[PDB]
Each structure stands twice: as structure tokens, then as C-alpha cells.
């Protein structure tokens, strides 16, 4: 979780 690279996405697609 936490560490997530959000250059071209906002978050995971799973919810």
C-alpha cells in the first residue's frame, strides 16, 4: 500500500 506511484493514475482500480 502506502508507497504508490501516481503519475498517470490516482490509485488502484480495485475500489
Amino acid at each position, epitope marked *: *500500500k502506502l*508507497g*504508490l*506511484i501516481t*503519475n*498517470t*493514475i*490516482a490509485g*488502484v*482500480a*480495485g*475500489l
Partner: antibody
Amino acid sequence: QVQLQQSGPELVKPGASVKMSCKASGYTFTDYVISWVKQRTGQGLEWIGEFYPGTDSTYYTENFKGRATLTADKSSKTAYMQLSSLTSEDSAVYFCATAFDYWGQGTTLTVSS
Amino acid sequence: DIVLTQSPASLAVSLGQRATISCRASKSVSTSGYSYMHWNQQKPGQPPRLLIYLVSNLESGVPARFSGSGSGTDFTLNIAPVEEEDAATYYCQHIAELTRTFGGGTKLEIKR
């Protein structure tokens, strides 16, 4: 630096299934969502879904809801996409990308009898 | 799904000219925070490469030659000026809404 090693070209017959691979290099595997995009030769780009190694969270688009199966082995920092019940219309190039930031060379899939 | 319409389908240009590609959203592509409109650059036989993310942000490695603008549902890729290695097919793409979708693409070609 981010690097995506995708399995070689795949030749299989209709009704079968394939498990394509994508080996991530240069980054902490759990930081990047793995995106799966389809491009039918000469056509545009189609998002299939994604596997997030951080929480194994996944998303499937309606057209791959039953067929596809996204997975990953944190051990070898590799992510797989499995497509089942293949048809001639599944014949395309399949990219895996670190959340649209970087894209592998892709895997050309040729379904035929 | 949210439809991203991209024009022109083909853009004839001359080496040196500037180039404006357009991408229009079906709905406002702003999430609670940023706007996830992205421009990709794909050449024959190769995978696409990221040029611009979040509307205006230059991906690492891409030259100041490329520029991104727009807001809400109207976005523009700006190449000033055009080079040999720029000649190819350009895609836009949204990530605000979901499912995530791409534009039909634009073919950047030489005028003669």
C-alpha cells in the same frame, strides 16, 4: 530504471488459454500498479485491467471479466496475465505497463488453428 | 465508458512546423485533486512511450519541445517544432474516471 521484460510471442489454438509474463526491473515491485493494455494490429489501445502487487488488488474490464486472470510473483517481481477460451479475435499485441508510466515491448499473441 | 475523441485522425505537417493535437473528454476528467489526461507517443513496431501526464507534466526524458494544455474536457498536445523522431502516432488517455480509456489516436505525418 523501470524496465519491463515480457514473455516472447505466443502461438496457440482457439479454445485454449495463455499465461503471458512481465518481469519488472529497476523499481520496488509494490510501488507500481501493473497495467494490461491490448492493441489489435493497426488498431487503437484498449485497457484490460490491472494487478497491484501491493495488495494483490485487481480490476477486470467487462470484456475480460471471465476470461482473464491477472497475477504476480513478488518473489521474482514478475506479473502474469492469463487469457482463457481464446479466439482469433484475441490475436493482438498485449502490453504490460507500470501504470502507463512505462510499457514493455509487449507480447504478440497469435490465436489460430 | 467515458469516450475520448481525438482529432485530427491524421495531421500532415512539415518538418519545422508546430503541431497541435486535440483530445476531448466525454465528461470532466478531474479527480478529487488532479486531472488525469495523458499523452503517449507510439512509433511503428514499438510500444507507446509517455510524454505528458496529468495534462501538462513532462515525463522524464522528453524535451521542452512538447507541451500540454487544456482543462475539464478539452486538452491539447503541442509540439513546437516538429522533428524526424516526432513523426508517428499520438494517443491521449484518461485515468480520472474508470474504466480507463484511450483516444483513437492521431497520425503525425510529413506534408509534401
